[PDB]
Amino acid sequence: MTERFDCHHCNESLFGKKYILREESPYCVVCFETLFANTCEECGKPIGCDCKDLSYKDRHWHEACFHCSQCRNSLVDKPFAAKEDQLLCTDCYSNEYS
Template identity: 35%
Template sequence: MDHFCCSNCQEHINGQSYVIHESQPFCLNCSERKADYCDTCGEHIKIDQPQKSHESQHWHATDACFYCYTCRIPLNNRGFFTYYGELFCSNKCALQRNKH
């Protein structure tokens, strides 16, 4: 009988909680270690949570984390860019950053 193992550490995960990522099983410890940190809230982005990424930055793909720095409008399903590490919906909002 084959054993069901974590794709990263090879630990047996039969009967334990696990996460599937890119069709591969990961134990919860490895899935946490592989997770990125959200640049807004600082929490892990769990491997099974939707996320947004740009260059080396990562965010939870939620209205609570992925929003314009200036006007706070949610950026899911909108264009965005980063300036000095912050998210913006428009040049106007980015220019207002310097006034804060």
């Protein structure tokens, strides 16, 4: 115990798990993720790397959150019409966009 083993940021003892030295200082796993994690425009919560972080057009999305508003199909790396707050299939989008 010569050195200190606490998240230099939350100062909470690292919880039963490995840790990252951030700012030359131990940070709890969560810190590293929450700090640089991306926000899921669908959930609004940071997307940790411990999950499928879908990245499309400098934006981020849970591979499960990215879907069509009508077919609820999971559009990923697939063509989609980006609506103001929704995503649709170029088939459904062209159905209303018309």
